[PDB]
Design a protein around this nucleic acid. Structure first.
Ligand SMILES: [Mg+2]
Ligand SMILES: [Mg+2]
Ligand SMILES: [Zn+2]
Ligand SMILES: [Zn+2]
Lengths: 162, 242, 107, 185, 52, 116, 107, 69, 77
RNA sequence: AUAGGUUUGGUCCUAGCCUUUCUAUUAGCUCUUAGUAAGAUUACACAUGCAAGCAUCCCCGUUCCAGUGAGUUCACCCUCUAAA
């Protein structure tokens, strides 16, 4: 047994199960919900489960978690200029509110794909570096010069042996 | 209308090649890690089979065959200063990123003051030494030597043969075309069109046999087996191309 | 395993160490299980095994002998599953150890 | 045995193994507990085999090479392309090198079968005639003789700067002759 | 943070000395009319300077 | 503590082991070490050629050209490499070395005609 | 613009024993490299209330100033977005109590 | 040493040049040592021997092989 | 090696700095070709400045980025 | 860590020391062919060979590499900018 009725939050796979990513200009993601009422079960389960995913996707955003505020909370967001986006949370499912927040603060999948393509283009393994951010230090290790003369011996072709 | 890289013609030629879901995606000897025993329904199984068939068809999109070539010794920028003094082939190229190896500029020099652009074989060897890929060995493969080729053709096993032939040379090399022609000629003798149904095959088999009129064995095998629609399609293709 | 016929399987003998106790535990475990045909007859769906060596080509092991549902098993959010933390740690490679699966009395 | 290829084809192999492997069927009497991460070095020694012979050297006539594919199949997994190195089995370093060489020869000749999951090629163009490795219109100076920058080839310079240099550097007497040839014996 | 005041003061004093003691091109640069050398430095002269 | 990032001064250092000659370009200032405070650290250079004589060189001039435009000096190795590469004309030092080789061959012909 | 790192940040007002200023704290989540859980972590900050609107007990946004004009102060409290206790609903949200609609809305 | 294995061990105090000073035990039938001796000391630990942590090695600047009758 | 302020040994600071070998015609060819190469290198440095300008233009003034930003703003609206 | 040894007349849970082996530095012992990386461990102290030249004197490397672990969240970012 595990220490948690919902141990999905501690299973590794949940970390990689992320997907949504906020914009590069977000600042604070103030969100309030209710826990005692049984009306907004969807939004409750959403805020309870699908949150560490977005947090691990980018832990550069502020979080606000309240207990009991009002039967009709909200989801106050913030943009570059620190605007105030208003929207209700009551009477909302989980995937619905997830898609809503992804469309509002989250970035479109096209932008993420473009960023991934740009990062791949930035990758240039053809370069040579003595073991750190690249592979094959010098041309000696790879099919070229003598494979590390400091270890493998050499015949009379070299100097100082005649 | 030859059109070697056509659409409908190549699609029909691939259709003539037996799909065989069990042969194309045969359980290879790879890192057989314990997979997941998911429970799929009828619709999901049908969709997965369709995806596998599409992947196998995409696997039959290569290679091209356009005869052999000749290693040309280019002579561009001549400098009457060296004339046989500085050798070792100096290469000063800028490796960008998204550029095919055929469009690179491997400025290979010569002992004289000329300016070569890397011979075909030398260019291929340098490309292989640079960025390898699925297999692809530097020098010629020992698997396709004289005695090795004879042993491979005598034991009847043209799956790994074509697999390595595609994953070793380039789609326009001398030894490549030679080995492919030898394998096709060996396949022609005695009907056995079946082993070539799990790898690159349409390189220069049906195309070459239709250009040189060698569809006798294939027609005999088709008549002995079955498939009347395929026979009519082949007759129509022969009437059109010829 | 040799007397049973198994040829390859790992076992983490954690907790206590005893012969009769281990045999009784193994018997209890093998008594409360469901075979492939039994699992297929229970759930109904086909027991497909996506072989990693092959492409997207499914291969069914035990086919159904009665029920045939059109809708597959759903993949809802946060599936309730309890697993061991040491297994995930060893899979990720958190701790260090040159004695887990290196050179032991294998085969 | 001289010209072997007969042990496996005889009844000795059936009476010995027949279906079990040869590398796993071994009991090392070293420091009990678990086999070591490094095994014995040279199988033979001088003229006798000191201690328990190698799991491979115990067999007198069977060799290690592509000719004996049964040994390679037994040493390699029945469904994986992983080679069980010597530290895992328990074989002399000589036999380990022999097995490595035999496996290399077999893989270079085309013995061990294996399906390669191929993908797209390295280039999109397929024609030995692209302009990147064909030719290029030469330059007018190059056609006339000396390429661009006419100061590349030798040119008899004036005498004023020669007198200047002779006036400067004098202790290092180094007189030349004339325009040297361009050949090379 | 505590800035190394001893080292800073030492370096500042050295720099102030080197600046205020700025010698013109005559004190230590006094060229000799025989030995063909310069005081302070004490280095040699090029072969051309044997008589220039 | 204060950098400079002004004019560059490419300095070399053939550091390595015996029977192993390998270049090592290091771009920095004139008043800076090699492994100390620098401006840009670029990859090394391949002196001797690889197998079957194929001296491959990776032209990493992308940022070097920008630094030159912003102010960057060169040394003898970088100058000779740029000259014998392709962008700059053939370095005059190497052309004159070829001329000296021609003179040496002429002297060898003279010696062969004189001696025997 | 804001020379400091944080630009916009929300926090509660607590410490106000000063002139034209109000200490504000920010609550953030920190992940453990073993427990795999986001734990709540608070950090006190110094704002700048140019006029002191409310006393204490209010969660309001902050605007980072260009350059700190003292020592550690960096934020500027110039707008109370909401009032603790009298939380406002999205639409037709009147100052009501907690879980008790004392102020009849839709009026 | 102990009650059951009533032997005649020669426990002598050995001061280390580093600084520490404790008791040690020299193995081998017959203690041929005396007092003034600069011999190497290894970290050998004997099984049944209370108050023993190190031993004397007759190798470093002493003897080569082992005593054989 | 030495470091300015050193006791400096005595087995080298007592010899004149002799100049290298200089052949009149060969050295004059050296210098003529070196002047030509230096002029060409200065021209190529000016061309490198121009190319850096062109690259900065293609990067910043690239209408593609501005159009993408405008489309993103419209999508946000 | 998949074995466990070590209590009690014996067993279970339960917890202390330890190998079985990879090893980096080494005591003795024995001590082939050909070739390489190291011969300051101690922020101990130092003979002899020395190690900074030079371009027409202007002048730079000398704040370079070369060694040590005294100290030891300077060894990386956001808002951006100092000579050049
Ligand atoms: Mg007892
Ligand atoms: Mg320290
Ligand atoms: Zn052996
Ligand atoms: Zn090196």
């Amino acid at each position: 047994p595990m220490k948690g009725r919902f141990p999905i939050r501690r299973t590794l796979q949940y970390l990689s199960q992320g997907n949504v990513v906020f914009k590069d200009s977000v600042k604070v993601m103030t969100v309030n919900y209710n826990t005692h009422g049984e009306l907004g079960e969807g939004a409750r389960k959403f805020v309870f489960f699908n949150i560490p995913q977005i947090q691990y996707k980018n832990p550069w955003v502020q979080i606000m978690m309240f207990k009991n505020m009002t039967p009709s909370p909200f989801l106050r967001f913030y943009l570059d200029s620190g605007e105030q986006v208003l929207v209700d949370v009551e009477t909302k499912s989980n995937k619905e509110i997830m898609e809503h927040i992804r469309k509002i603060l989250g970035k479109n999948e096209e932008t993420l794909r473009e960023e991934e393509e740009e990062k791949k283009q930035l990758s240039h393994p053809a370069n040579f570096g003595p073991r750190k951010y690249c592979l094959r230090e010098c041309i000696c290790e790879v099919e070229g010069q003598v494979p590390c003369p400091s270890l493998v011996p050499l015949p009379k072709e070299m100097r100082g042996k005649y | 209308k030859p059109t070697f890289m056509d659409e409908e013609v190549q699609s029909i030629l691939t259709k003539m090649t037996g799909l065989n879901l069990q042969k194309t995606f045969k359980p290879a000897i790879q890192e057989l890690k314990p997979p997941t025993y998911k429970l799929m329904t009828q619709a999901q199984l049908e969709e997965a089979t369709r995806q596998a068939v599409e992947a196998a068809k995409v696997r039959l999109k290569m290679p091209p065959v356009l005869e052999e070539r000749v290693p040309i010794n280019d002579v561009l920028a001549e400098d009457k200063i060296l004339e046989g003094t500085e050798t070792t082939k100096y290469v000063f190229t800028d490796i960008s990123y998204s550029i095919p190896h055929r469009e690179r500029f491997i400025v290979v020099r010569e002992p004289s003051g000329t300016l070569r652009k890397a011979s075909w074989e030398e260019r291929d060897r340098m490309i292989q030494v640079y960025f390898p890929k699925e297999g692809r060995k530097i020098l010629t493969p020992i698997i396709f030597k004289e005695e090795n080729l004879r042993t491979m053709y005598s034991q009847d096993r043209h799956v790994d043969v074509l697999n390595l032939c595609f994953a070793q040379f380039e789609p326009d090399s001398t030894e490549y075309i030679k080995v492919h022609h030898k394998t096709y000629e060996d396949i022609d003798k005695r009907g056995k069109y079946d082993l070539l149904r799990s790898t690159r095959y349409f390189g220069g088999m049906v195309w070459y046999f239709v250009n040189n009129k060698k569809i006798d064995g294939l027609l005999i095998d088709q008549i002995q087996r079955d498939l009347i629609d395929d026979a009519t399609n082949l007759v129509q293709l022969y009437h059109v191309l010829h | 395993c040799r007397l049973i016929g198994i040829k390859d399987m790992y076992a983490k003998v954690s907790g206590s160490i005893n012969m009769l106790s281990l045999t009784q535990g193994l018997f209890r475990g093998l008594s409360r299980q469901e075979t492939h045909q039994q699992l297929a007859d229970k759930k109904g769906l086909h027991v497909v095994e996506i072989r990693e060596e092959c492409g997207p080509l499914p291969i069914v092991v035990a086919s159904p002998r009665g029920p045939l549902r059109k809708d597959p098993e759903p993949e809802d959010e946060v599936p309730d599953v309890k697993l061991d933390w040491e297994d995930v740690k060893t899979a990720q490679g958190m701790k260090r150890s040159v004695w887990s699966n290196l050179k032991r009395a294998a085969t | 045995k001289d010209e072997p290829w007969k042990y496996l084809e005889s009844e000795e192999y059936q009476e010995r193994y027949g279906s079990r492997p040869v590398w796993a069927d071994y009991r090392r009497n070293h420091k009990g507990g678990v086999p070591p991460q490094r095994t014995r070095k040279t199988c033979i020694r001088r003229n006798k085999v000191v201690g328990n012979p190698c799991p491979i050297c115990r067999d007198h006539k069977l060799h290690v090479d592509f000719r004996n594919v049964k040994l390679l199949e037994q040493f390699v997994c029945a469904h994986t392309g992983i080679i069980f190195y010597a530290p895992y089995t328990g074989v002399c370093v000589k036999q380990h090198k022999r097995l490595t060489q035999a496996i290399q020869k077999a893989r270079d000749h085309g013995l061990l079968i294996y399906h390669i999951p191929q993908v797209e090629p390295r280039d999109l163009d397929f024609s030995t005639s692209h302009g990147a490795v064909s030719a290029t219109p030469p330059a007018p100076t190059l056609v006339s003789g000396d390429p661009w920058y006419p100061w590349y080839n030798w040119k008899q310079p004036p005498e004023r700067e020669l007198s200047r240099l002779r006036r400067l550097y004098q202790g290092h007497l180094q007189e030349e002759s004339g325009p040297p040839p361009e050949s090379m014996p | 943070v505590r800035p190394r005041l001893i080292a800073e003061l030492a370096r500042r004093v050295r720099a102030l000395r080197e600046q205020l003691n700025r010698p013109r091109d005559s004190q230590l640069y006094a060229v000799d009319y025989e030995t063909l050398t310069r005081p302070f430095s004490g280095r040699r002269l090029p072969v051309r300077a044997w008589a220039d | 503590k204060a950098y400079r990032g002004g004019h560059l001064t490419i300095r070399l250092a053939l550091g390595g082991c015996t029977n192993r000659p390998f270049y090592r370009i290091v771009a920095a200032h004139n008043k800076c070490p090699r492994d100390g405070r620098f401006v840009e650290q670029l990859g090394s250079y391949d002196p001797l050629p690889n197998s079957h004589g194929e001296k491959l060189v990776a032209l990493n001039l992308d940022r070097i050209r920008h630094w030159i435009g912003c102010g960057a000096h060169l040394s003898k190795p970088m100058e000779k490499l740029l000259g014998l590469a392709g962008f700059f004309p053939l370095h005059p030092m190497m052309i004159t070395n070829a001329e000296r080789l021609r003179r040496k061959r002429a002297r060898e012909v003279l010696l062969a005609s004189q001696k025997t | 613009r804001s020379s400091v790192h944080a630009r916009w940040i929300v926090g509660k007002v607590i410490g106000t024993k000063m002139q034209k200023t109000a200490k504000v704290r920010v609550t953030r989540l920190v992940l453990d490299p073993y427990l795999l859980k986001y734990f709540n972590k608070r950090k006190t900050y110094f704002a700048h209330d140019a006029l002191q609107q409310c006393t204490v007990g209010d969660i309001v946004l902050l605007r980072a100033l260009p350059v700190p004009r003292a020592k550690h102060v960096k934020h500027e409290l110039a707008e109370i977005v909401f009032k603790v206790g009298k939380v406002i609903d999205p639409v037709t949200g009147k100052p009501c109590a907690g879980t008790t609609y004392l102020e009849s809305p839709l009026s | 040493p102990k009650k059951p294995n009533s032997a005649n061990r020669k426990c002598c105090r050995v001061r280390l040049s580093t600084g520490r000073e404790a008791v040690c035990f020299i193995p081998g039938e017959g203690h041929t040592l005396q007092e003034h001796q600069i011999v190497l000391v290894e970290g050998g630990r004997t099984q049944d021997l209370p108050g023993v942590k190190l031993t004397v090695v007759r190798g470093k600047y002493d003897c080569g092989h082992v005593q054989k009758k | 090696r030495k470091t300015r302020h050193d006791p400096l040994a005595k087995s080298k600071i007592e010899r004149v700095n002799m100049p290298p070998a200089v052949d009149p015609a060969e050295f004059f060819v050296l210098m003529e070709r070196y002047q030509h190469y230096r002029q060409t290198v200065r021209a190529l440095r000016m061309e490198f400045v121009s190319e850096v300008q062109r690259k900065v233009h293609e990067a910043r003034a690239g209408v593609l980025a501005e159009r993408k930003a405008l489309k993103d703003a419209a999508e946000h609206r």
